[PDB]
Nucleic acid binder design. Structure first.
Ligand SMILES: Nc1nc2c(ncn2[C@@H]2O[C@H](COP(=O)(O)OP(=O)(O)OP(=O)(O)O)[C@@H](O)[C@H]2O)c(=O)[nH]1
Ligand SMILES: [Mg+2]
Lengths: 1341, 277, 251, 50
DNA sequence: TCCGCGTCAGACTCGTAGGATTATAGCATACGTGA
DNA sequence: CACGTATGCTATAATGTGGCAGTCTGACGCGG
C-alpha cells in the first residue's frame, strides 16, 4: 500500500525497526502557541482573554469611575501577505475591543445607576503568524524563536564551597515567581538562616516570620521538637522518647525503673533502643547538670509576682532551674537540638535577630528596600503585603504553583498565585531538612526545571505591558475629567500598546530574519530554542554547566546541534518527536511495557516523570508480537544506563531517531561519524544553496520526504482528485466526489510562486510535479519547492567522487572538480537582489526621477525609458543607471576651473545634481521586475502609469478566469444533477449555458441542489465585481511612505552564478572544502569504462576527522548508482516489463532483515516503467539514523550492481593514460554548495572615504573599507624590524590626512617617499583629555 | 544611607509647614507688600504641590528632579502674582503656573534642536486629530487624511510631521551587539577622498602649464575673468577694469582662448573622453 | 550630521553638555531670584550630577540612560574602554591599500610567491599604475588614467604586470599570534577571485583551505618594500622565533 | 562512565554511545570558543610588559 | 587585621540587517531683524 | 509692518517618590 507520488519513485529502506509512531508535523510549536494567544477562549486565560481580565477592570483613584472589558475582535488583515511583502508593511489585524465606562455616585454609597457608556475602541494592529509559522514585519519574513527559561517554583541550591576557604557548603532556597520579587533564604558559615528579599541586603530569616505575626514561642514550636522535664521530689526527671537518643553517646548513666540500661560514656545501639521502647519507658531520672544548655520553649513566669523568670528560647542554667522550681513549675518544655540531624538554626537566628515584635520586623524590611525613608505602619504593612501577597504584583502561575507544591511534597497541584504564610514556612523547613542531611538539592540544568515559552506567551506579555502603560493614563483621566461628557475612547491611547508589540515583533532579539537558504534551514530555524534574550541568560552569564548536554536532553533536545561559537549550548534544536506539555515542559513519546509485553500504547513523559520509570532502549530486540527476546534488556533509569530483567522494564524508546533533531536526522551514516564533525554537518546543510536542477539524494534517510512536505515550501494537495489543468504558473485539480463538498464548486486552484527573492537573495521557484490528467490523493505533492525533488528534500547534488591525492590540488581539504560539473550547470545557483531608489523632498526642493540627467552618455540613457526607469529584461553591469534621479542644488558657486569647464561645453544643465540609483560595482545581472510606490497627491510618472495599466488588466484577467473556471465547474455539476432524474444529455448542451436560470426539475432533494448551485453562481457574480473594485482601488491607491519621501522605485536584478575556484563546498558529514581548480575532462581520473570522476577529494581529510559516514555514503552511493546503471541499460534496450520487474523486486527485497516489504507485482505495467525511468539515474536508498545499512548489506547491494565489494576500482590518469598503482575508492557523495561564494567575499581598496571623527578609513566591503590592522598585526611588525611598514600603517594609510594625500601624489609622481605626520586620532585623544580638564601638552625640543 | 539627591530633597520638603486658608491670606498680604520670610514660607509650604504634579509629568522628556525644579520656578511666579484679595484659593491658581512652566521647559530642553512653541502647538492638534482618526479608521492617519480633517494644506501637514522625526544616536551601535557604531559606517562627506583631491591638484597644475601654451594676450583675459590667476572672478564687462577696457574685443578673445584650448584637449586625448566627466 | 533620510544623528556628549548648561543657567536664574536655600541646594546637587555624568557616567552611581535605555557615552568612556580610542584607533587601525579574499592552494608556486587576483591587484596598485601611465605618456592626466582603468583597457593590464614585478605584498591571517602570521611574498597575477597560498607556509599561518581568508597589504615606500623583501619575506623567515626547529615543511 | 564503548566508528556506536560521546565533544568545542580569550589575554599582558 | 562591598579585567579579522516612542491647551501680547 | 519666536496668564480644592538589576567571576584593594 503506497501513495501515487511514491509509486513514481520508491526509496529502498535499510531500516529494520518498525515505526509505531510517524514523525509529527515539524512546525507544530509555532502554530499551536500563537494560535493560543489569538484563540478566543471564554474561560481558559490564554493570550488576550487572560491579559484583559488580569488588568481590567481598571477603577479610578476616586472610585467614582471604572473602565471594564467586554470582548475583543480582530479585523481582517488590510493587506494580504503578498501586498505586505511588496509594499514593506506589517501583516497584521486591527484589534477592536468593547469596553464599558461605568460610573458610580459619590452621594449614593455604591450606586452604579448613573452612566454606562459602551463602545468598541481600536488598540493597535497585532502582527499575524503565516500558515508556515512566520511573521511579515515591514515586508520582511521573520521568525520568533521559542525561549528556554527557569520554571517558576522553588529551587534548593548550594555553593559547593566557593565562599570561605573554610570550604563550608552553604545551602539556599530561591522562590521564583513568574511575576514578582524573588524570595531568597540562605545559610551563613555560622549556621544562621538569612532572608534576601529581591536579592537585596541580608536580613535574619526570623524577621520575615515576625512580619507574618509569629511570636517567638510559636516560631520555636514550628521548627523545633519539644522535650518535657518533670521536677519530682528532689531528683530531675525527663519524658523519654526511645529513639531520640539513637546514635548518641550516653553522657549520664541511664537508669530505667531501678535497672541500668546504658553505661555512661558508651554509644547507644539499636538493641538498647528496642529494649527501652518495649519496656515502655516514659520517665528517666537525670542529673541537674544535663539541663545546662537546654533551650526553654515557652515563656515561664512567677505566678506570685507575675514577672518573666525566663523568656522563650533562652539557654537554661542550674540557677534558672532552681528559680523555676521554687516558683511552682514542675514541668519545663525544652527544645530538641542534637547537632547532626536536629540542628538549632532558627534558635541561633532569633538571637541574631535585632527585632522584637511584628511592627519592628515590618519596619526593618521596609528600611531594607527603601533605606532612609521614615517608616509608617500603614506604609510597612502595605509594602510587605504588596511584595508577595498582592494578586496584582505577584503570580507564580499554574506552573509555578504546581512545581512549588510538588517540591514541598503536596497532594494538590493547583492553587493560589500568591505566597501563603504556610508556603514560606514549608520552604524554610525543607531548606533546614536539607542542611540536616535528609532531603536533596534540585538541579537547575535539569530539563524538569527548564521550561519552554514559544510565541504566544511572549506576545501575551508584551501585550500586558501595553495595557499597564494604558492603565496609568486611563486611571489618571478617569479621576480628573467630568464623567458624563467624557467617553472611554478619549481616555485610551492605541500608540502605547501598538508600540509595545511593534518593539517585540521588530526590535526583539528573538524576532530575527528567517534563515531561508533552503527548506531545512527554515524548518530548523522555526524549531529553535534559545536560552538568550530578555528574561534569559546572557553570553556573559552563561557558564560551562548550562552549555553541556544533560541526561534529560534525551528525546527532548538534540545533543548534536548547537552553534559552534559564543552561543554554543545556549541555542538548541528541538528533537524530532519532542513536544511541549500543557505547562510548557518538554516531553517525549515512549511505548508502555505491560507484563513484559510491549504495547503500542504511547505515553509522552516529562523530564520529571521520565526519572521514575525504567525505559528500554529502542534497539532492544522485541520478539514477534509480544515481549523482549533477550532476558537482560539494556535500559536506563535514574539518569544512568545498564542491564535490567524483563519484569523490571516499564517503557521503551518509540524510535531510534527520537534522540536526534531534524537536521541531524538527514545525515545518513551518523552512527559512524564523530559527534563534532556531525554537528558541523547538520549546521552546513542549513547553508546549502539550492541549485538550478534540484537533485534528490541517492543515499538518504527517509526524513527527506517528511521535511519537504512539513516545510510548506512544496504545494501539497488537500482534496486530491484528478488534475484538470497544469501550467508553469498554476495547478487546477478537479476534486473527487467523496471529499468534494456539495456546497461550493469542487475545483481546487493552487497558484505556484514563480522565481521570487529570498531573504538571503537566493531563488524561490515552485515547479509543477504532476502531469496533466494525473489522479492524486490527499497529501500528495503537487508542486516542488526550491530544494525538493518529487516530494523529497534535495539540498544539493550527488557526484562521482574518488578519494585520492592530485598534484596538491586537494591539499588541505581543497577540492578538485571536473569541468563536466560546470558544463552540466550542476551547482549553478540563482540569486535575486532588490535595489531601491528613493525620491525625497529636501529643503531646496523635491528630487526628480527624469531620464534628463546632467553629464550622462547616450549609452547610459539608451537603457532608460521615457520616465527614467530601466526596461524589463535589460542586462546591466556596474555603473549602468537603473533609475535616473537628480537632486536640486542650492549654492551654484564654482571653482574657477569649473566656471571655465561649464563655459567650454556650455552644458550648464541649470542647477541639478546626479543622485541616480546605479548598479553596484562588479555585480552584473538582468532586470526581472520593477515596482513603483508613489504618494497620493503627486503627478504619476509615465512609467508608473503603464505599470498600473499592466496590473489592472492582469487583475481583470485573473478574476475573469476565476469566475469562468468556477462557473464552468459549477454548471458541469448542475448538468450531472439534471441528468439524475431528467435525461436531457444532447438537448441541454445545445441551448446556451447563460439561459439556464429557467431550467429545473420536480421538487425533490435534487431541486434543492439546483438552488444551491444557482445561489452560488450569482454570489460569485457579485463577488467578482466587489473583488475587482478592491483590486482597482489598491492599484490606484497612493501608498503612504516615510515623511520626506515622494516615491520609491524598486528594481529586481537576477544573477546566474557559476561554480568557480574559491567557492565553498561540503558534504553532510561536516567535510568542508574550497574549490582549488577546475580540471579539463581529459585530465580527470577515469574508469576502465572510460567514465571520468566528477570530484577528487583528499583521503587525508577522513581518518583524522573520524567522519567515516562519508566513505560509507560513497560505497552505498556507488552501489545505488550501480543498480541505476543496470536499469538504465535495460531501459535503453527496451526488454521485457516481466524482466525489469524481476530484477527490481529482487533489488528492493535484498536486505538481511529489511523492514520495508515491496511486493512489486500489484504495480501496473505503466506504473513500473515510470518507476524504472526514475530509478535509472540511481536507485535512491534510505539509511535511518542508528538503524542504518550494514557493511554486509552494502557489499551485497554492490554485488547486485556487479561492482566490487571493496568499492575500490581501477582508475587511469587522464593525463598520462597509465593506471594508478593501487585501487581507489570511488562512488557517489551527495555534495552541497554553501552560501559562501568567493564572488561575495573578494574585496580590495587603495583609497576611499574616511571616518567622521577618527579620520581612519571605514570598515566592511559595503562601506568600501580598509582591512583592520589590529594590535596583534602591529606586534608582528614590531617583532620583525619593520618600522617604516608600521609607521605607514599608522599614519599615511590611516589618520594622517595631509600625509595620505601627499604620499598619494608622490606615488603617482613615482617618488615612493613617506613624509609622515600626526595621526588625527591622537589630536582627538588630546582634545578628549582636555575636555576632562586635564592639561596635556606637547613639550617641544 | 540616604545618598540619592531625590530622596534627600523630598525628605527636606516633608519637613516643612502645611498652610491653611487664613494663613495663606496673612502670609500672602505680607508677601506682596514684600516680606522675606512670607515669600520663603509660602514657597516652601507649597513645594509638595509641585511634586504631586511633577510626579504625574515624568517619562516624557526630562527626569523627575528636572521637572520638579522647573515646576518650582512656576511656584515662585505664582507667589509673586497671587491675588489674596480674591476669595478663591492659592492651590487652584498655583496649579496653572506649575503646569505652564513644566510644559514650556519640556517643549524646549527635550527636543535636541530648539523648536518653536508655535510649530509645537500646531503639531499637538495634528497628533490629537491622528488619535481620533485611528480609533475610527482601524489603520493609522495619512498626512492627507489629517489635512482633510483640519481643512489645512497637505504641504503644511507634511512639513510639521517632518519636524516630529526624533534624532538617532551615532555613538549607539547597530550590528546586533557592539560590532560597529553608526559613526564608523557614516563617512565625512564635505571631505573629498584623496583620489578626488589629487584629481583637482592635476587640473590646477595642468592649467598653469596650459596658461604657458596659448597666446600671452589670450591667457591674460581668459584667466583674469574666471579668477584662475587673478584675485577676483570678473565677468565679460568687468575685464575692462584691468587694461582690456573693451566689451566686444574681450568676448572675442575669451572665446578665441577657449577654441585653441579645445583643440589642445582633442589632441592630448580628452575632449569627448573627458565629456562624460 | 544629517542622515540621507533627512533625519539628524548626534553624539551623546551633546545631550550631556545640554544637561549641564540647562541646570547651570537655571542655577544662575535661581540665584538672581534669591530663591530659598532648599531649592538652591537641589539645583547645586543636580549641577554636580550633570557634570559628573558628562565627565564619567556610571562611576557616580546610576548612569544617565538616554533614548534606548543605554547609558549615554561620556568623555571618559571614549578614552577608557578597550573600545576607547587607545586600543581601537591608536594601537591598531584600518588601513589603505588593504584587501582580502578566500585563500586556496598554489602548489605550482615557489616559496616566495603568492597568487594575487587580477581585479584585486588592479585596485591595490592604483596610484602606481597612474604614475607609470603618465611617464609612458599613454595617459594625458590622472582622471583620464582613472577612466582607462575603469574601462579595464588591454594596455592597462600590461602596465599593471610591469608595476607588480619585484614588488612584495604582505599576507596576514587572523589571528596573528606570532610574527610569522604576517609574511611578504612576490605576487603572481592570476585570473580568478581567490588568493593562492604556498603550502609550506600554511604551517606558520595555521592556514587550512576550508574557507579561511587573508588580508593583503601593499608596502608603498622604498623602505617598506625593502623591509618586506629582507626581513618579512617568506624565504627569509624559515626558522621559528620560538624554538630553532623550522615550520616551513610540506605534508 | 563505568560501562565503556566497546563498539567503534566502523561497527557503529549505539544511540547511547553516541549521546554519551556528545558531552566530551561539545565541551571541546566550547573550550575553543571560550578559553582562547584567557590565552590571548595572557599574550597581551606579556607583550605589554616586554 | 579580617569580613566585604567595590572596582577592574574577559584572542583577531570577515559578515547580515536596518531601527523606535510619547505629548505636552487656546490665545494675545511680545521682542527681534529686514524693507 | 510682519513673520517667527517668546513670554504670559487663567482662581472649587488639591500640599512626602516608588519601575527595573537578575545573583558572571576570579582578583585585589580600602574602611570598620
Ligand atoms: N583562530 C581561530 N581558529 C579556529 C576557530 N575555530 C576553528 N579554528 C581553526 O580551524 C581549524 C579546524 O581544524 P584544523 O586546523 O583542520 O585541525 P588540524 O589541527 O589540522 O587537525 P585535523 O583536523 O586532524 O587535520 C583549526 O586549526 C582551528 O585552530 C576560531 O574561532 N578561531
Ligand atoms: Mg587540517
Amino acid at each position: 500500500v503506497y501513495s501515487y507520488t511514491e509509486k513514481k519513485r520508491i526509496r529502498k529502506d535499510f531500516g529494520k525497526r518498525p515505526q509505531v509512531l510517524d514523525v509529527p508535523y515539524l512546525l507544530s510549536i509555532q502554530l499551536d502557541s500563537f494560535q493560543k494567544f489569538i484563540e478566543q477562549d471564554p474561560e481558559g486565560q490564554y493570550g488576550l482573554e487572560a491579559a484583559f481580565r488580569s488588568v481590567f477592570p481598571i477603577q479610578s483613584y476616586s472610585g467614582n469611575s471604572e473602565l471594564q472589558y467586554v470582548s475583543y475582535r480582530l479585523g481582517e488583515p488590510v493587506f494580504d501577505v503578498q501586498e505586505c511583502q511588496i509594499r514593506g508593511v506589517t501583516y497584521s489585524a486591527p484589534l477592536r475591543v468593547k469596553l464599558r465606562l461605568v460610573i458610580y455616585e459619590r452621594e449614593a454609597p455604591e450606586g452604579t445607576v448613573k452612566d454606562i457608556k459602551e463602545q468598541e475602541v481600536y488598540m493597535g494592529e497585532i502582527p499575524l503568524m503565516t500558515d508556515n509559522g512566520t511573521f511579515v514585519i515591514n515586508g520582511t519574513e521573520r521568525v520568533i524563536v521559542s525561549q528556554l527559561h527557569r520554571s517558576p517554583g522553588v529551587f534548593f541550591d548550594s555553593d559547593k564551597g566557593k565562599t570561605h576557604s573554610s570550604g563550608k557548603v552553604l545551602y539556599n532556597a530561591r522562590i521564583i515567581p513568574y511575576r514578582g520579587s524573588w524570595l531568597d533564604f540562605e545559610f551563613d558559615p555560622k549556621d544562621n538562616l538569612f532572608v534576601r528579599i529581591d536579592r537585596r541586603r541580608k536580613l535574619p530569616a526570623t524577621i520575615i516570620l515576625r512580619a507574618l505575626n509569629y511570636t517567638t514561642e510559636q516560631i520555636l514550636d514550628l521548627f523545633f521538637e519539644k522535650v518535657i522535664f518533670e521536677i519530682r521530689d528532689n531528683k530531675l526527671q525527663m519524658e523519654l522518647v526511645p529513639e531520640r537518643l539513637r546514635g548518641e553517646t550516653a553522657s549520664f548513666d541511664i537508669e530505667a525503673n531501678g535497672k541500668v540500661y546504658v553505661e555512661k560514656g558508651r554509644r547507644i545501639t539499636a538493641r538498647h533502643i528496642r529494649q527501652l521502647e518495649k519496656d515502655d519507658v516514659k520517665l528517666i531520672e537525670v542529673p541537674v547538670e544535663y539541663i545546662a544548655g537546654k533551650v526553654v520553649a515557652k515563656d515561664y513566669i512567677d505566678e506570685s509576682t507575675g514577672e518573666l523568670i525566663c523568656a522563650a528560647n533562652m539557654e537554661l542554667s542550674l540557677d534558672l532551674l532552681a528559680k523555676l522550681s521554687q516558683s511552682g513549675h514542675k514541668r519545663i518544655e525544652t527544645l530538641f537540638t542534637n547537632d547532626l540531624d536536629h540542628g538549632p538554626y532558627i534558635s541561633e537566628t532569633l538571637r541574631v535577630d535585632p527585632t522584637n515584635d511584628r511592627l519592628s520586623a515590618l519596619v526593618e524590611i521596609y528600611r531594607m528596600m527603601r533605606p532612609g525613608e521614615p517608616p509608617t505602619r500603614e506604609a510597612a504593612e502595605s509594602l510587605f503585603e504588596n511584595l508577595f501577597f498582592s494578586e496584582d504584583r505577584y503570580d507564580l502561575s499554574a506552573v509555578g504553583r504546581m512545581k512549588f507544591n510538588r517540591s514541598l511534597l503536596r497532594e494538590e497541584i493547583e492553587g493560589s498565585g500568591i505566597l501563603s504564610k504556610d508556603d514560606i514556612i514549608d520552604v524554610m523547613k525543607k531548606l533546614i531538612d536539607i542542611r540536616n542531611g535528609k532531603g536533596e538539592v534540585d538541579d537547575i540544568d535539569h530539563l524538569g526545571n527548564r521550561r519552554i515559552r514559544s510565541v504566544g506567551e511572549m506576545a501575551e506579555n508584551q501585550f500586558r505591558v501595553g495595557l499597564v502603560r494604558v492603565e496609568r493614563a486611563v486611571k489618571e483621566r478617569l479621576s480628573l475629567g467630568d464623567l458624563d461628557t467624557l467617553m472611554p475612547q478619549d481616555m485610551i491611547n492605541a500608540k502605547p500598546i501598538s508600540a509595545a508589540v511593534k518593539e517585540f515583533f521588530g526590535s526583539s532579539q528573538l524576532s530575527q530574519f528567517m534563515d531561508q537558504n533552503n527548506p531545512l534551514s527554515e524548518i530548523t530555524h522555526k524549531r529553535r530554542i534559545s536560552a538568550l534574550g530578555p528574561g534569559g541568560l546572557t553570553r556573559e552569564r552563561a557558564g560551562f554547566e548550562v552549555r553541556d548536554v544533560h541526561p534529560t536532553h534525551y528525546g527532548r533536545v538534540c545533543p548534536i546541534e548547537t552553534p559552534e561559537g559564543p552561543n554554543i549550548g545556549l541555542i538548541n534544536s528541538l528533537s524530532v518527536y519532542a513536544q511541549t506539555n500543557e505547562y510548557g515542559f518538554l516531553e517525549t513519546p515512549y511505548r508502555k511495557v505491560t507484563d513484559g509485553v510491549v504495547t503500542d500504547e504511547i505515553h509522552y513523559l516529562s523530564a520529571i516523570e521520565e526519572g521514575n520509570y525504567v525505559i528500554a532502549q529502542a534497539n532492544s530486540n522485541l520478539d514477534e508480537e509480544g515481549h523482549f527476546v533477550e532476558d537482560l534488556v539494556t535500559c536506563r533509569s535514574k539518569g544512568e544506563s545498564s542491564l535490567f530483567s524483563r519484569d523490571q522494564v516499564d517503557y521503551m524508546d518509540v524510535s531510534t531517531q527520537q534522540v536526534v533533531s531534524v537536521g541531524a536526522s538527514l545525515i545518513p551514516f551518523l552512527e559512524h561519524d564523530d559527534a563534532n564533525r556531525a554537528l558541523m554537518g547538520a549546521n552546513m546543510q542549513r547553508q546549502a544553496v539550492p541549485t538550478l536542477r534540484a537533485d534528490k539524494p541517492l543515499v538518504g534517510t527517509g526524513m527527506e520526504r517528511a521535511v519537504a512536505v512539513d516545510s510548506g515550501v512544496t504545494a501539497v494537495a488537500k482534496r486530491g482528485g484528478v488534475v484538470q489543468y497544469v501550467d508553469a504558473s498554476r495547478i487546477v485539480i478537479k476534486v473527487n466526489e467523496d471529499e468534494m463538498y456539495p456546497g461550493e464548486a469542487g475545483i481546487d486552484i493552487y497558484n505556484l510562486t514563480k522565481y521570487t527573492r529570498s531573504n538571503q537573495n537566493t531563488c524561490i521557484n515552485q515547479m509543477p510535479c504532476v502531469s496533466l490528467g494525473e489522479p492524486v490523493e490527499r497529501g500528495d505533492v503537487l508542486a516542488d519547492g526550491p530544494s525538493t525533488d518529487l516530494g523529497e528534500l534535495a539540498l544539493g547534488q550527488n557526484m562521482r567522487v574518488a578519494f585520492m591525492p592530485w598534484n596538491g590540488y586537494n591539499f588541505e581539504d581543497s577540492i578538485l572538480v571536473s569541468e563536466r560539473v560546470v558544463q552540466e550547470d550542476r551547482f549553478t545557483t540563482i540569486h535575486i537582489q532588490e535595489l531601491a531608489c528613493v525620491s525625497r523632498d529636501t529643503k531646496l526642493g523635491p528630487e526628480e526621477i527624469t531620464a534628463d540627467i546632467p553629464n550622462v552618455g547616450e549609452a547610459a540613457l539608451s537603457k532608460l525609458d521615457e520616465s527614467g526607469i530601466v526596461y524589463i529584461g535589460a542586462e546591466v553591469t556596474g555603473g549602468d543607471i537603473l533609475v535616473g534621479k537628480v537632486t536640486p542644488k542650492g549654492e551654484t558657486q564654482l571653482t574657477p576651473e569649473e566656471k571655465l569647464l561649464r563655459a567650454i561645453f556650455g552644458e550648464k544643465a541649470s542647477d541639478v545634481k546626479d543622485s541616480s540609483l546605479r548598479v553596484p560595482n562588479g555585480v552584473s545581472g538582468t532586470v526581472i521586475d520593477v515596482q513603483v510606490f508613489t504618494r497620493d497627491g503627486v503627478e504619476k510618472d509615465k512609467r508608473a502609469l503603464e505599470i498600473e495599466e499592466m496590473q489592472l488588466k492582469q487583475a481583470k484577467k485573473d478574476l475573469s478566469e476565476e469566475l469562468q473556471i468556477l462557473e464552468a465547474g459549477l454548471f458541469s455539476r448542475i448538468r450531472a444533477v439534471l441528468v439524475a432524474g431528467g435525461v436531457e444529455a444532447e438537448k441541454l448542451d445545445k441551448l446556451p449555458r447563460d439561459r439556464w436560470l429557467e431550467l429545473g426539475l420536480t421538487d425533490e432533494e435534487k431541486q434543492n441542489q439546483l438552488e444551491q448551485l444557482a445561489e452560488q453562481y450569482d454570489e460569485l457574480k457579485h463577488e467578482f465585481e466587489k473583488k475587482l473594485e478592491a483590486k482597482r482601488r489598491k492599484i490606484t491607491q497612493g501608498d503612504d511612505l516615510a515623511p520626506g519621501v515622494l516615491k520609491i522605485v524598486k528594481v529586481y536584478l537576477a544573477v546566474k552564478r557559476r561554480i568557480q575556484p574559491g567557492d565553498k563546498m561540503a558534504g553532510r558529514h561536516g567535510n568542508k572544502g574550497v574549490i582549488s581548480k577546475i580540471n579539463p575532462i581529459e585530465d580527470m581520473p577515469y574508469d576502465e569504462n572510460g567514465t571520468p570522476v566528477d570530484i577528487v577529494l583528499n583521503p587525508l581529510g577522513v581518518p583524522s576527522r573520524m567522519n567515516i559516514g562519508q566513505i560509507l555514503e560513497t560505497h552505498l552511493g556507488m552501489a545505488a548508482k550501480g543498480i541505476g546503471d543496470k536499469i538504465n541499460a535495460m531501459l535503453k534496450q527496451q526488454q521485457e516489463v516481466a524482466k525489469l520487474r524481476e530484477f527490481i523486486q529482487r533489488a528492493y527485497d535484498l536486505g538481511a532483515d529489511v523492514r520495508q516489504k515491496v511486493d512489486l507485482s500489484t504495480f501496473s505495467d505503466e506504473e513500473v516503467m515510470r518507476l524504472a525511468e526514475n530509478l535509472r539515474k540511481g536507485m535512491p536508498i534510505a539509511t535511518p539514523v542508528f538503524d542504518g545499512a550494514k557493511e554486509a548489506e552494502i557489499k551485497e547491494l554492490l554485488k547486485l550492481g556487479d561492482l566490487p565489494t571493496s568499492g575500490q576500482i581501477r582508475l587511469y590518469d587522464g593525463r598520462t593514460g597509465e593506471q594508478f598503482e593501487r585501487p581507489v575508492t570511488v562512488g557517489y557523495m551527495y555534495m552541497l554548495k554553501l552560501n559562501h561564494l568567493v564572488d561575495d567575499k573578494m574585496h580590495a581598496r587603495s583609497t576611499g572615504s574616511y571616518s567622521l571623527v577618527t579620520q581612519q578609513p571605514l570598515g566592511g566591503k559595503a562601506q568600501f573599507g580598509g582591512q583592520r590592522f589590529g594590535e596583534m598585526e602591529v606586534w608582528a611588525l614590531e617583532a620583525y624590524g619593520a618600522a617604516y611598514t608600521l609607521q605607514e600603517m599608522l599614519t599615511v594609510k590611516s589618520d594622517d590626512v595631509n600625509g595620505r594625500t601627499k604620499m598619494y601624489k608622490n606615488i603617482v609622481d613615482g617618488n615612493h617617499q613617506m613624509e609622515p605626520g600626526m595621526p588625527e586620532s591622537f589630536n582627538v585623544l588630546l582634545k578628549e583629555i582636555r575636555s576632562l580638564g586635564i592639561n596635556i601638552e606637547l613639550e617641544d625640543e | 544611607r540616604v545618598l540619592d539627591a531625590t530622596q534627600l530633597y523630598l525628605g527636606e520638603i516633608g519637613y516643612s509647614p502645611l498652610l491653611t486658608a487664613e494663613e495663606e491670606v496673612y502670609f500672602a498680604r505680607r508677601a506682596l507688600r514684600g516680606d522675606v520670610a512670607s515669600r520663603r514660607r509660602m514657597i516652601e509650604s507649597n513645594l509638595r504641590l509641585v511634586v504631586k504634579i511633577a510626579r504625574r509629568y515624568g517619562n516624557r522628556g526630562l527626569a523627575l528632579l528636572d521637572l520638579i525644579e522647573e515646576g518650582n520656578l512656576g511656584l515662585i511666579r505664582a507667589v509673586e502674582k497671587f491675588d489674596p484679595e480674591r476669595g478663591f484659593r492659592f492651590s487652584t491658581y498655583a496649579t496653572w503656573w506649575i503646569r505652564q512652566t513644566i510644559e514650556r521647559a519640556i517643549m524646549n530642553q527635550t527636543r535636541t534642536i530648539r523648536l518653536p512653541i508655535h510649530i509645537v502647538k500646531e503639531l499637538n492638534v495634528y497628533l490629537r486629530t491622528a488619535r481620533e482618526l485611528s480609533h475610527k479608521l482601524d489603520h493609522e492617519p495619512s498626512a492627507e487624511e489629517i489635512a482633510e480633517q483640519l481643512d489645512k494644506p497637505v504641504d503644511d501637514v507634511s512639513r510639521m510631521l517632518r519636524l516630529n522625526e526624533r534624532i538617532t544616536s551615532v555613538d549607539t551601535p547597530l550590528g546586533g551587539d557592539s560590532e560597529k557604531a553608526l559613526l564608523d559606517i557614516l563617512a565625512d562627506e564635505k571631505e573629498n577622498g584623496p583620489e578626488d583631491t589629487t584629481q583637482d591638484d592635476d587640473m590646477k597644475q595642468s592649467i598653469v602649464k596650459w596658461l604657458f601654451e596659448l597666446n600671452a594676450k589670450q591667457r591674460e583675459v581668459l584667466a583674469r575673468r574666471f579668477g584662475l590667476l587673478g584675485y577676483e572672478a570678473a565677468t565679460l564687462e568687468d575685464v575692462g577694469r584691468e587694461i582690456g577696457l573693451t566689451r566686444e574685443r574681450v568676448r572675442q578673445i575669451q572665446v578665441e582662448g577657449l577654441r585653441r584650448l579645445r583643440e589642445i584637449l582633442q589632441t592630448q586625448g580628452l575632449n569627448i573622453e573627458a565629456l562624460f566627466l | 550630521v544629517p542622515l540621507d533620510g533627512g533625519r539628524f544623528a548626534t553624539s551623546d556628549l551633546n545631550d550631556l553638555y545640554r544637561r549641564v548648561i540647562n541646570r547651570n543657567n537655571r542655577l544662575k536664574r535661581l540665584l538672581d531670584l534669591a530663591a530659598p536655600d532648599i531649592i538652591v541646594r537641589n539645583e547645586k546637587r543636580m549641577l554636580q550630577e550633570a557634570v559628573d555624568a558628562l565627565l564619567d557616567n556610571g562611576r557616580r552611581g546610576r548612569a544617565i540612560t538616554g533614548s534606548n535605555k543605554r547609558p549615554l557615552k561620556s568623555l571618559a568612556d571614549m578614552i577608557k574602554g578597550k573600545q576607547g580610542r587607545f586600543r581601537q584607533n591608536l594601537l591598531g587601525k584600518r588601513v589603505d591599500y588593504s584587501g582580502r579574499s578566500v585563500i586556496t592552494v598554489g602548489p605550482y608556486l615557489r616559496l616566495h610567491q603568492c597568487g594575487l587576483p587580477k581585479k584585486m591587484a588592479l585596485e591595490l596598485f592604483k596610484p602606481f599604475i597612474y604614475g607609470k601611465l603618465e611617464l609612458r605618456g599613454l595617459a594625458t592626466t590622472i582622471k583620464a588614467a582613472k577612466k582607462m582603468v575603469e574601462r579595464e583597457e588591454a594596455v592597462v593590464w600590461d602596465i599593471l604586470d610591469e608595476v607588480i614585478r619585484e614588488h612584495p605584498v604582505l599576507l596576514n591571517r587572523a589571528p596573528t599570534l606570532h610574527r610569522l602570521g604576517i609574511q611578504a611574498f612576490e605576487p603572481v597575477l592570476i585570473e580568478g577571485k581567490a588568493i593562492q597560498l604556498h603550502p609550506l607556509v600554511c604551517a606558520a599561518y595555521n592556514a587550512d583551505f576550508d574557507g579561511d581568508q587573508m588580508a593583503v597589504h601593499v608596502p608603498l615606500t622604498l623602505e617598506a618594500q625593502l623591509e618586506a623583501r629582507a626581513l618579512m619575506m617568506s624565504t627569509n623567515n624559515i626558522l621559528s622565533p620560538a624554538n630553532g626547529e623550522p615550520i616551513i615543511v610540506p605534508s | 562512565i563505568e560501562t565503556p564503548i566497546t563498539a567503534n566508528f566502523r561497527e557503529g556506536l549505539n544511540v547511547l554511545q553516541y549521546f554519551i560521546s556528545t558531552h566530551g565533544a561539545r565541551k571541546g568545542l566550547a573550550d575553543t570558543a571560550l578559553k582562547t580569550a584567557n590565552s590571548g589575554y595572557l599574550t597581551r599582558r606579556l607583550v605589554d610588559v616586554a
